[PDB]
Amino acid sequence: CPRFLKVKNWETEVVLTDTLHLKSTLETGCTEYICMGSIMHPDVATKDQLFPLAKEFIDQYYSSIKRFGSKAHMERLEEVNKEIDTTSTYQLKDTELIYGAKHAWRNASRCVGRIQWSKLQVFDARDCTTAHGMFNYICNHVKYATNKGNLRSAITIFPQRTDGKHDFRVWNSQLIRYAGYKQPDGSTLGDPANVQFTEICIQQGWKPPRGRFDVLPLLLQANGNDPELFQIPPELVLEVPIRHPKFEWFKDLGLKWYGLPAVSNMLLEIGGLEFSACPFSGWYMGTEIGVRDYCDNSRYNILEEVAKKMNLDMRKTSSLWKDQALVEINIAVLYSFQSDKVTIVDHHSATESFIKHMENEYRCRGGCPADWVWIVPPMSGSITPVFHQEMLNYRLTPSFEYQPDPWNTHVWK
Amino acid sequence: RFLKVKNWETEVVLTDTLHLKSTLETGCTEYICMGSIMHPATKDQLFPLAKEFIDQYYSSIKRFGSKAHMERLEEVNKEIDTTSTYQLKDTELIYGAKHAWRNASRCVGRIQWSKLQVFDARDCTTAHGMFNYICNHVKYATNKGNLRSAITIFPQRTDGKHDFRVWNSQLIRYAGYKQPDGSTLGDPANVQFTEICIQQGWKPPRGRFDVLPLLLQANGNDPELFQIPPELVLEVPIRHPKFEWFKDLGLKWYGLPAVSNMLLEIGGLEFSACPFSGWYMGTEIGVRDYCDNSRYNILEEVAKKMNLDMRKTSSLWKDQALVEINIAVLYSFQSDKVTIVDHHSATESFIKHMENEYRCRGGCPADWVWIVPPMSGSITPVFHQEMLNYRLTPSFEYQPDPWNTHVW
Numbered sequence: 001c002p003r004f005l006k007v008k009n010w011e012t013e014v015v016l017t018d019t020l021h022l023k024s025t026l027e028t029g030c031t032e033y034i035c036m037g038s039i040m041h042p043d044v045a046t047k048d049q050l051f052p053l054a055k056e057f058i059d060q061y062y063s064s065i066k067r068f069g070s071k072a073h074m075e076r077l078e079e080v081n082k083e084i085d086t087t088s089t090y091q092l093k094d095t096e097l098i099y100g101a102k103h104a105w106r107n108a109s110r111c112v113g114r115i116q117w118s119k120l121q122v123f124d125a126r127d128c129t130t131a132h133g134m135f136n137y138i139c140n141h142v143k144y145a146t147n148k149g150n151l152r153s154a155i156t157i158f159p160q161r162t163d164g165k166h167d168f169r170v171w172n173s174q175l176i177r178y179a180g181y182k183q184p185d186g187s188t189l190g191d192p193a194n195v196q197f198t199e200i201c202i203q204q205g206w207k208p209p210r211g212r213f214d215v216l217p218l219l220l221q222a223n224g225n226d227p228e229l230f231q232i233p234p235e236l237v238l239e240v241p242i243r244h245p246k247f248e249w250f251k252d253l254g255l256k257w258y259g260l261p262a263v264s265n266m267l268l269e270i271g272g273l274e275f276s277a278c279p280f281s282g283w284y285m286g287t288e289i290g291v292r293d294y295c296d297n298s299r300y301n302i303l304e305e306v307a308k309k310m311n312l313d314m315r316k317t318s319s320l321w322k323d324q325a326l327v328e329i330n331i332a333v334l335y336s337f338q339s340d341k342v343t344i345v346d347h348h349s350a351t352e353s354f355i356k357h358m359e360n361e362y363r364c365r366g367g368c369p370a371d372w373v374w375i376v377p378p379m380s381g382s383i384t385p386v387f388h389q390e391m392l393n394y395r396l397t398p399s400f401e402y403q404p405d406p407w408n409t410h411v412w413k
Numbered sequence: 414r415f416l417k418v419k420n421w422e423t424e425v426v427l428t429d430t431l432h433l434k435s436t437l438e439t440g441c442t443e444y445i446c447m448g449s450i451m452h453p454a455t456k457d458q459l460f461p462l463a464k465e466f467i468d469q470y471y472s473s474i475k476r477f478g479s480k481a482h483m484e485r486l487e488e489v490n491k492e493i494d495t496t497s498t499y500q501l502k503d504t505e506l507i508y509g510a511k512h513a514w515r516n517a518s519r520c521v522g523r524i525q526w527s528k529l530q531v532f533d534a535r536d537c538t539t540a541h542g543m544f545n546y547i548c549n550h551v552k553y554a555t556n557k558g559n560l561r562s563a564i565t566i567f568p569q570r571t572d573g574k575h576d577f578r579v580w581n582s583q584l585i586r587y588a589g590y591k592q593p594d595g596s597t598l599g600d601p602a603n604v605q606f607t608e609i610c611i612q613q614g615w616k617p618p619r620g621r622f623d624v625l626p627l628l629l630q631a632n633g634n635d636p637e638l639f640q641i642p643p644e645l646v647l648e649v650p651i652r653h654p655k656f657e658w659f660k661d662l663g664l665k666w667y668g669l670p671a672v673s674n675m676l677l678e679i680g681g682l683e684f685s686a687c688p689f690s691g692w693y694m695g696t697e698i699g700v701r702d703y704c705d706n707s708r709y710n711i712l713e714e715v716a717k718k719m720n721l722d723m724r725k726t727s728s729l730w731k732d733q734a735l736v737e738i739n740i741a742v743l744y745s746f747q748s749d750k751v752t753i754v755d756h757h758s759a760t761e762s763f764i765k766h767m768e769n770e771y772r773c774r775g776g777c778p779a780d781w782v783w784i785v786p787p788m789s790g791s792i793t794p795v796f797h798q799e800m801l802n803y804r805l806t807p808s809f810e811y812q813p814d815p816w817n818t819h820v821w
């Protein structure tokens with residue numbers, strides 16, 4: 001690879017220079033002949049594989065604290081090396097854990113919210129042993145991050161992987177999600193994205209309310225044991241009823257959403273260590289709710305019912321009735337969250353912040369990995385400043401990664 | 414190896430085998446993806462490129478290995494020997510031009526690819542000749558509003574010193590003027606080209622919708638100015654089906670989108686002047702050609718006349734105004750019987766095209782970054798469509814602006 005890569009902004013003509021890509025680690029999926037940039041997703045590590053991965057991370061940490069090559073740096077290297085030799089693994093210090101988690105976010109090429117990356121509250125849950133203890137940690141996480149509507153980003157980090165047979169997992173994809181119920185007639189009640197997980201919960205003993213907005217229980221696996229169900233205390237689940245500043249009939253749709261987006265199915269890799277349970281949360285960009293959660297056809301799919309109440313012509317697509325209704329839905333979502341003093345960011349503000357963040361990273365870090373396909377919002381893309389911004393995508397470590405769904409791999413006891 | 418693409422809305426999986434037939438670079442590597450970067454001969458190089466193209470042409474007409482195929486290969490071989498180049502047959506020229514469109518990974522309009530009218534202008538020698546061919550193209554493609562895809566192919570590059578170039582980026586564009594008080598009258602994308610026309614003797618009317626002259630370079634000579642006869646330039650006044658004040662904005666656009674600055678590569682030959690045209694997707698006018706900050710930038714006025722609260726972005730006043738502008742554009746073209754497609758219909762057609770291509774061809778190279786419309790992305794079917802991007806030839810390529818290379 002060449003040592004400098006240039007990215008241009010075609011709206012502003014600003015040209016930036018990336019050198020950070022020289023530190024990229026794993027693969028993108030692309031090759032010289034094919035680009036897989038729109039592909040969504042393109043038995044543990046041995047002693048020999050772990051040594052270089054740990055040294056690389058330790059070097060990076062000590063370089064970040066301006067202590068590279070110091071006595072403490074060399075001692076930490078040797079202590080890690082000894083520990084890998086005699087135990088086939090090692091343990092991160094709390095400082096390294098915190099640094100690692102913040103940098104996995106800083107490195108998340110698909111995240112538009114990264115201007116916030118250094119303000120992450122990291123909860124160390126590596127002393128957890130049981131699913132009840134996981135539940136306690138997750139409740140405290142949710143209560144802290146929710147903060148009565150003044151949301152704070154947070155991550156809770158459960159014990160790392162050992163042999164792969166003792167994994168901690170949150171079986172939920174997000175901590176807070178609504179159930180979906182497949183009906184005998186083919187229709188779906190609630191959130192259609194969640195039918196499979198909902199059926200699993202019912203098999204594990206969940207008694208479903210069978211409603212439109214039923215918060216799913218947590219399904220929590222500790223130390224490789226079978227997962228266990230826990231109901232989140234409903235007073236910890238902050239929710240926002242959706243109304244519209246102009247359309248009085250919009251409240252009659254009976255819509256609401258929860259305030260806290262919290263991803264719980266990803267894997268945090270730090271120094272070759274694998275944290276298979278690391279729920280993290282921030283706050284919503286409006287379009288995540290208003291465009292996707294409500295208007296995706298395979299989701300709540302309310303565009304038609306909003307358009308009908310707006311009395312648009314729905315017989316020609318060229319009336320753009322869908323686009324009109326989509327904007328009004330996203331107006332209502334932002335207005336409902338702001339009126340209830342629950343933190344939310346519109347896509348204009350978020351993308352402008354991300355451009356400012358990206359420019360600072362280029363100037364201070366030598367680059368900023370970004371996945372344009374994900375960074376550009378799902379509505380009004382070209383009137384946001386990221387649409388015109390060329391981006392380089394590459395994988396830095398520490399990182400968040402996808403992992404298989406645990407019901408596909410779990411060996412039931 | 415076979416590759417799969419999933420649509421996450423329908424869960425349809427397609428299997429791509431066609432990418433195995435690509436040879437040019439994408440710009441990405443195993444470690445860096447450049448999927449959102451806009452821009453990432455001799456005898457000895459030519460014959461393999463010619464052989465490959467002849468091979469795929471005689472394979473496309475089910476006469477691979479025929480006597481006609483062998484003789485064509487020998488004919489081309491001898492011709493590169495004695496002249497350092499060769500000439501395409503008419504049938505080959507048409508095949509290569511349709512397939513360059515078919516292979517254009519950034520084009521959502523490719524369902525039409527095999528209905529392309531190909532105008533052979535390889536006998537052209539002067540800018541007056543180019544002007545004639547271009548007027549005939551414009552008149553044919555416009556067709557009184559029933560727009561027809563077309564491409565006009567001028568002589569191929571020879572020694573790089575005698576290139577044919579259309580200096581305009583599009584055949585029909587409005588001028589942009591650097592206003593002394595700071596801003597820009599007309600179209601701000603074309604300010605530089607507008608000044609080169611004035612520098613070449615063009616008398617600007619200095620309006621908001623002044624059609625630029627053609628600036629045409631034949632055989633490497635200095636380019637020459639021509640005015641497209643105005644009866645050939647179909648325009649649409651933009652009005653709105655419900656907002657009666659919208660027509661008072663004074664806006665109009667031309668009906669014919671016609672790219673004139675790209676290079677057509679066929680069998681190793683380079684056609685540096687190959688203007689091609691189709692019809693508009695409405696967002697091309699109404700999102701980009703009006704609302705880009707570096708373009709006409711009329712969102713504020715529309716939102717103003719709509720009495721929208723513009724004090725904070727979270728009112729989404731920009732998004733509301735954007736939709737109404739695009740409603741008006743579609744309404745206007747349709748009301749004037751000028752061919753236009755909305756981004757919902759266009760992306761539907763492209764998904765159908767993709768399925769067609771995977772079944773008959775083994776894949777379809779597609780550039781998600783460019784295929785997804787610049788507004789309402791995820792309520793179109795292409796947003797949820799995984800795509801593989803790879804470079805097949807014949808192809809359209811970018812080239813440098815002539816005013817950076819030409820010696821006067």
Ligand code: HEM
Pocket residue numbers: 101104105108110111112113114116120153154155280281282283284285288345350374400
């Ligand atoms: C603080 C406010 C935040 C905002 C506004 C935000 C915004 C977003 C958005 C809009 C996406 C794309 C969502 C989608 O379409 O699925 C995303 C993805 C992502 N975010 Fe952030 N995020 C925030 C916080 C965080 C935090 C705290 C972390 C981790 C420490 C994080 C890590 C990620 C990752 C890994 C992805 C990729 C998700 C995937 O590939 O499925 N984000 N973010």
Ligand code: HEM
Pocket residue numbers: 510514517519520521522523525529562563564689690691692693694697754759783809
């Ligand atoms: C017939 C109706 C057509 C429609 C609706 C259409 C639509 C589009 C759109 C929306 C783009 C995005 C480009 C941009 O945003 O600037 C595009 C790109 C492109 N189109 Fe099509 N197109 C059509 C016809 C054609 C024809 C006839 C050709 C060639 C024979 C062609 C070749 C291309 C190429 C090469 C690009 C890539 C341009 C670039 O890389 O800058 N298109 N098309």
Ligand SMILES: Cc1cc(N)nc(CCc2cc(F)cc(CC[C@@H]3C[C@H](F)CN3C)c2)c1
Pocket residue numbers: 174260261262263280281282283284285288289292293
């Ligand atoms: C920490 C964080 C903050 C934030 N703001 N976002 C995320 C992204 C992950 C995510 C979490 C979530 F709780 C809901 C969605 C949106 C729902 C779905 C997911 C699918 F991609 C289509 N919809 C957009 C996406 C993470």
Ligand SMILES: Cc1cc(N)nc(CCc2cc(F)cc(CC[C@@H]3C[C@H](F)CN3C)c2)c1
Pocket residue numbers: 583669670671672689690691692693694697698701702
């Ligand atoms: C043959 C053809 C048909 C069609 N429908 N489209 C194209 C795409 C190229 C293009 C040509 C054109 F004559 C006007 C635009 C307006 C778009 C503008 C250009 C600028 F880069 C920012 N906008 C996106 C774009 C080609």
Ligand SMILES: C[C@H](O)[C@H](O)[C@H]1CNc2nc(N)[nH]c(=O)c2N1
Pocket residue numbers: 010387388389390391449450451782783784785
């Ligand atoms: C940075 C990015 O590559 C650039 O803005 C691209 C993005 N996608 C696009 N898509 C289309 N259809 N047209 C464009 O001009 C662009 N510009």
Ligand SMILES: C[C@H](O)[C@H](O)[C@H]1CNc2nc(N)[nH]c(=O)c2N1
Pocket residue numbers: 038039040373374375421796797798799800
């Ligand atoms: C096929 C395509 O990769 C897929 O629809 C992606 C596109 N971009 C996205 N961008 C975001 N932010 N979130 C998504 O879920 C997706 N989905």
Ligand SMILES: [Zn+2]
Pocket residue numbers: 030034035036037441445446447448
């Ligand atoms: Zn790529």
